[PDB]
């Protein structure tokens, strides 16, 4: 029972962003099982897109319907969400569903039962940037790193491989004037581990394919 | 009067058939109510019959069903099949049946009515009402002072 979105989290103005959804553990034809697209714009809400059936059947919100396509792959379990032409409004999290129906006279579209964890995609001009991490040193003990100038979110940051969960608290990234994004994170520890335990963050930038490991360090 | 006599008809223009709502006829009109009374079968021809006014809406259908592959179930409209005149609400819906075949017939033996067309079934694409017609004798001065 799982769906997991996939694609770039970065398009320019007047292309068309193509991503795609992993179903596991149903078939993507099983009889009474739709599948739709769902978009939501940062601190919006949400707008459907479109819904395909087990069938080859679509449909779509009359509101995007002349720009997106979308289809599913019965062989690999899979789908795809294709948006021609976007502009600066089709920046948002695009979110994979499965959607119940009720039989009647028609298949009537229903209850999303199960959803994935969607995929920001921002639509600019600019083009994709890494992150420079830099270690903030501890000092009942503060550490932590900074992940700077980079294009665009998300970012995922992890420390010790996912080891250390207690304690971690990662801000919100700050959107600098120069169009590239700062993000912090830090894990109040006891200072008394400093010098016993390692302490690595696994700053993580999709968009860029960049993978930073940091040991942060005390002096 | 009670006389076969009683009545005249100059023109055949002063026939006039009249095509009543169901809605008109106090009767359940949302989507899903209004789908129950529709159906689909094989071995029945549709038929299609001309008539001359009818009741301004007060609900109508723009449907398009298919099976699951694509193709529709309901009939592609004919060169006279005009949307329904004069809706006041109309429903679009579009979908597909997993186990349905033929043509849309309307149960109650009802017509579906278009723009001055009434038919045994549901065009895909087409607005439409349920009703039923009747036919009467107006004259033109009659027919000049209701309408104008
Ligand atoms: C009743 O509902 C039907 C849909 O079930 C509506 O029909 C739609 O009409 C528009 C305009 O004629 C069609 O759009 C155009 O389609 C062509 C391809 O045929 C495309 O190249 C154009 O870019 C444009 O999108 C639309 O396809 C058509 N749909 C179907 C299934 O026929 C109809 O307008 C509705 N009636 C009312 C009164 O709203
Ligand atoms: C004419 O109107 C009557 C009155 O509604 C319809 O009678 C309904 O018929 C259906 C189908 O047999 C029944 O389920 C309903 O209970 C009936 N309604 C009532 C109030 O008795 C009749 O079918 C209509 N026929 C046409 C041609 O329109």
């Known amino acids: 029972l799982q769906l997991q979105e996939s694609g770039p989290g970065l398009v320019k103005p007047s292309e068309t962003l193509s991503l795609s959804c992993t179903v596991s553990?149903?078939?993507?034809?099983?009889?009474?099982?739709?599948w739709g697209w769902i978009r939501q714009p940062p601190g919006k809400g949400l707008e459907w897109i479109g819904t395909?059936?087990?069938?080859?059947?679509?449909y779509y919100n009359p509101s995007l319907k002349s720009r997106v396509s979308i289809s599913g792959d019965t062989s690999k379990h899979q789908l795809s969400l294709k948006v021609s032409s976007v502009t600066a409004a089709d920046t948002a999290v695009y979110y994979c569903?499965?959607?119940?129906?009720?039989?009647?006279?028609?298949?009537?579209?229903?209850?999303?039962?199960?959803w994935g964890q969607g995929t920001l995609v921002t639509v600019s001009s600019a083009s994709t940037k890494g992150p420079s991490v830099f270690p903030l040193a501890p000092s009942t003990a503060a550490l932590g790193c900074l992940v700077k100038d980079y294009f665009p979110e998300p970012v995922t940051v992890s420390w010790n491989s996912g080891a250390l969960t207690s304690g971690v608290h990662t801000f919100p990234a700050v959107l600098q004037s120069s169009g590239l994004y700062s993000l912090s994170s830090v894990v109040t520890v006891p200072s008394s581990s400093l010098g016993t335990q390692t302490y690595i963050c696994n700053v993580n930038h999709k968009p860029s394919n960049t993978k930073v490991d940091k040991k942060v360090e005390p002096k | 009067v009670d006389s076969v006599c009683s009545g005249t008809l100059q023109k055949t223009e002063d026939v006039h058939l009249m095509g009543f709502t169901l809605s008109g006829q106090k009767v359940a009109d949302s989507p899903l109510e209004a789908s129950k009374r529709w159906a689909f079968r094989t071995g029945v021809p549709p038929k299609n019959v001309e008539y001359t006014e009818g009741e301004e809406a007060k609900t109508c259908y723009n449907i398009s069903v298919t099976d699951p592959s694509g193709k529709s179930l309901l009939l592609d409209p004919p060169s006279n099949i005009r949307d329904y005149p004069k809706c006041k609400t109309v429903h679009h819906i579009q979908g597909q049946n997993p186990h349905a075949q033929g043509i849309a017939l309307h149960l109650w033996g009802a017509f579906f009515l278009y723009d001055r067309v009434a038919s045994t079934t549901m065009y895909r694409g087409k607005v439409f009402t349920e009703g039923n017609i009747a036919a009467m004798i107006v004259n033109k001065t009659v027919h000049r002072m209701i309408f104008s």
């Open positions: 569903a499965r959607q119940r129906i009720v039989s009647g006279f028609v298949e009537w579209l229903s209850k999303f039962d199960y």
């Open positions: 553990g149903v078939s993507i034809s099983d009889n009474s099982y739709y």
């Open positions: 395909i059936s087990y069938s080859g059947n679509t």
